[PDB]
RNA sequence: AGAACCUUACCUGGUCUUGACAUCCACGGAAGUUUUCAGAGAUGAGAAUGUGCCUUCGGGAACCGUGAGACAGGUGCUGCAUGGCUGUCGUCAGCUCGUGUUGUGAAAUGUUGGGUUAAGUCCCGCAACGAGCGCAACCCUUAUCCUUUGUUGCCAGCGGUCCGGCCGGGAACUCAAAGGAGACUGCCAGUGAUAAACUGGAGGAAGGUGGGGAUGACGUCAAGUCAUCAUGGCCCUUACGACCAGGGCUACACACGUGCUACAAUGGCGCAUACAAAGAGAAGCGACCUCGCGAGAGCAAGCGGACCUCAUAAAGUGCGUCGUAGUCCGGAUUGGAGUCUGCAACUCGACUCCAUGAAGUCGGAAUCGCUAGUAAUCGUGGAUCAGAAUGCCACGGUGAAUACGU
């Protein structure tokens, strides 16, 4: 099985907003370098939030809250500095944080 | 039961009276609300005058009451007895 | 509700870093299990007594607009009603209703 | 159509891979040997079960993969994954399989624990005065 | 009430034998969820019973199912500042079951020192006709038998029965106008 | 008082959100006070435009405000010298340099929040609102979409009792899932106390305004992006 | 949603009133930082680093002491003065909008009938016509299934080989996140006024708008919050404000609501053994390591979470063991120490462990949810979270009787 190059990841609370960042940058990266993959898609986080719904007491009732977190991986086997410049300059998603650190 | 796991105490908060104290051996009762604070050798003979948040309980310190806090001898709560209720809080 | 309770740790945490912060590791160092025969002496550990109210252990902060206590939610610095205000009106992103 | 013909063993929530191809009756579940498995089990005679009836368990080889699940339970849908699976004996082979019910899935799927709810649908009980 | 008929669920095969039967008594025979035991402490239990004699595991089973089985059933509707008993026909889909509920019953006190045979033994019992639920049939075909005196407040409904085409008495039976 | 918050549940489909910003959990807490505080101070220099939305928005090194309006020029105002005001008083509260642009004006005489500023006068000026209800509702169905819903709460005319009226005309769904649909919650005071209408107003059953991609992987990026998933 | 202290939300005790905290003016100090002593801490006195920023070059802002006014502040009172927001009946299955007509009118009619429906669903239809709200619908999610991606996912054969996708390497495969496919009470058949729909037939994972959710009309109840918060009327403004500590929300007479776990042997004990899903952890949590009776510890690879870790998930599997005796179940109290979170473990915190060692054997009056992935029952993670979960939220394992009849 493969070892790890390196880690491009683009994170969101949006769903919409990360496929959309991302089919941009992917293309960015194939106009702008010669050895991309397509974004294989990692699973989704979602974190569990329950809160009243009356201002005061109805204890029973209840209402309850999600919110998503999205990851896309890319993997270019090598970016050039011109990958990422083309990437940053391209760039134009509020949604996202991409990230070229690696953890 | 519990401790105060592994670090040094004499009480921050006491330290800065009890000095003082133990320069005369002993003096008039020291105005304490340091209840948070252990009995030691060092403070044998002292008299520690110990609000409880109410007010102040003197707790003469002494050698067979070593193994206790002074939060211990001067009471906090109320309790209701049950032949018939409690009128009084008991110092 | 009440401002003061917000006041009281305002002033707090300006405390907590000016004493603690060099002094994090003081605990570890002079008190705790890496003291071993090493230091355990009152004497370099008897100068937190102003950093009393600044102590990290009193840092349960509550709701940050208002500074009423209790059913605090560290993840938004909100609390349960003024939560809900805020996602009923789409303020926060990415945050929804649930269904499963 | 396939290389070796697969099955996905779904019962109850859990999915049971299932890779068949022909050879002498040989087994391998979870990457070590049936005897380490389901060892002084009843469960190492469910999985032959299915394949004593289609009368091929000294003639079908197997390859088992299994996630999800209980020891018991897992043999139970490693019974499914096998039935889901043969599908090319015969062209008729899958509907005889499904007729019996070992390809149907089980369609119930699960219900979320509710908002305002001690379970799933476990309303509160109160009596409070 | 209700505006259709409505099914039910049905139990399959189980996994190690191949019957629906023996699925069936397991389910019943499951406490606190642990069908894992339940299974292996019915079979172990069918076991014994082949012991007693070996010509079936099934033998002495399925004739306990018959031998403590209800026909006819009680029911009960309030009339007023009373309640009395009004008798009903029972359904073959509960008559199983109920002769399966007062094996298990009987079964959790016999008081052997592991359930296969608390089972066991309370089946050869119910095998014979002879256990603990041939009363309790019995004595429920006996409020059957009697009960069907009263009918569901039968003396302003029994001119409106036989006005409406219906016969000259008041039905002692679910679901008449009496 | 029955029934979920309307725009509440919009928010996963056919509704955008109001912010969208990325704080990677550990800094959430800090960047929800940040975006409240930047709606408040921007909102609290333009008190004189007309407004329909607020939208706010971090990309890399930067804050983007959306603002829905009027006309475009009201926030622009003489020689731009206004919005660069604004994108000044947001560089101070945000921890990145500025923008603010101005969005797409669309039903600026039929919106939830302009039509309640619209009635709430009524109140203010503490007439009776005996006919007042019907002749508001009257007004929105010749401005445009396919039903309306107001209720009407503050004490009408300085009043020692609680007197509420409402108003319902054409279709409104309440609960609907499906198309964005319009609503307003105002507060605002007058001399007696405190006013408020809250304003329904429904155009149509499918809205299309926020959708997930229309494409898979495939079609979608870059035209070779199949692996030789081995293939030495 | 996690009350030793903070929770001034409360109380008492210390202590001050332009005021803990903001703007505006007057004066002294830069704020920031480091440090000794008194004082319980607030507070106070002093030392030492720095003199930035603007400048009618006075002096000031920031922030701090002091003062005046404006004013700040108030879980301050009134919810029959209210706004914002939401509970109840109830998913009741009803309710109304536009409009005409009939009565003198309040009001009816429609909204009632026949058939059918999970529902005012829908056919037929009358002076009611046309139309809307709620249930229905769109909706998200899941289920196979088709599709692409091909890792931190996957492995039918092959290589290194302890036979583990760890890695040479491989793409048949689930599989993730997303394009979305299929199912329409449709087709065909019986029935029913083809007329909605129920039942039968079939392929398929599935035929009753597939399972799950979202989901609550118009609205009484003078419902409930001025204590999230808006806010008048309206009260205090050396305080009905505020810093600091200690006490306290978890008291104790008892009774009551709720949940847990036990009362067994279907089990508990011991040694050995197996697979989850989903999510949190760069203030943090963490393998291996060596130490420690265990708890934990220090060291430290690591972990942005499909990688590493909580976590060996438990129930379940193997085998012996125990016999109704409160036991071999249950393990509470309490003596005593070892350890943890923390500048503080006493009333009110967390864990290991030694000795000693009880109630409880299916529970009066009372009392509630459930139609099937449900009821029942086990374990897990997480929000909250300095320190405290039996709770709550969600996940997955194992998973029940029956629904004839009105």
Known sequence: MQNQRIRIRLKAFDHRLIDQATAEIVETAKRTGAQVRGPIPLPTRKERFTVLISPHVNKDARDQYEIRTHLRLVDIVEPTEKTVDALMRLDLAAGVDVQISLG | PRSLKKGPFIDLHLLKKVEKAVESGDKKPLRTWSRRSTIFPNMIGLTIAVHNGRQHVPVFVTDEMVGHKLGEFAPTRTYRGHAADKKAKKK | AKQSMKAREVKRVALADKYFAKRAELKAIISDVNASDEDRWNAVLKLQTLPRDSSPSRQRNRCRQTGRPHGFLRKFGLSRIKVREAAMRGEIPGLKKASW | ?129 | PRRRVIGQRKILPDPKFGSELLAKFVNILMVDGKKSTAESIVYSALETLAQRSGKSELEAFEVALENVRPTVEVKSRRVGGSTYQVPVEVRPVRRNALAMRWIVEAARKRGDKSMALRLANELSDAAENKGTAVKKREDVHRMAEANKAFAHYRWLSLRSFSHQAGASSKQPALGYLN | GQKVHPNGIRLGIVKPWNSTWFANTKEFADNLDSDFKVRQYLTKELAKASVSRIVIERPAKSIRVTIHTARPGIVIGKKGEDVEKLRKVVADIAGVPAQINIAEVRKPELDAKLVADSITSQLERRVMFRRAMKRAVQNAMRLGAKGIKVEVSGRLGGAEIARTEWYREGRVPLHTLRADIDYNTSEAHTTYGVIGVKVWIFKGEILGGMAAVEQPEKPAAQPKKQQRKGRK
Do not use: C, W
């Open chain 4, 1 to 129: 159509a396939e290389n070796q013909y697969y099955g996905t063993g779904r019962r109850k929530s859990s999915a049971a891979r299932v890779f068949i191809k022909p050879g002498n009756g040989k087994i391998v579940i979870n990457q070590r040997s049936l005897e380490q498995y389901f060892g002084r089990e009843t469960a190492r005679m469910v999985v032959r079960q299915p394949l004593e009836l289609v009368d091929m368990v000294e003639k079908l080889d197997l390859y088992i993969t299994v996630k999800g699940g209980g020891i018991s339970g897992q043999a139970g849908a490693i019974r499914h994954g096998i039935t889901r699976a043969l599908m090319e004996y015969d062209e008729s082979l899958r509907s005889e399989l499904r007729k019996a019910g070992f390809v149907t899935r089980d369609a119930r799927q699960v219900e979320r624990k509710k908002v305002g709810l001690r379970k799933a649908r476990r309303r509160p009980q109160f009596s409070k005065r």
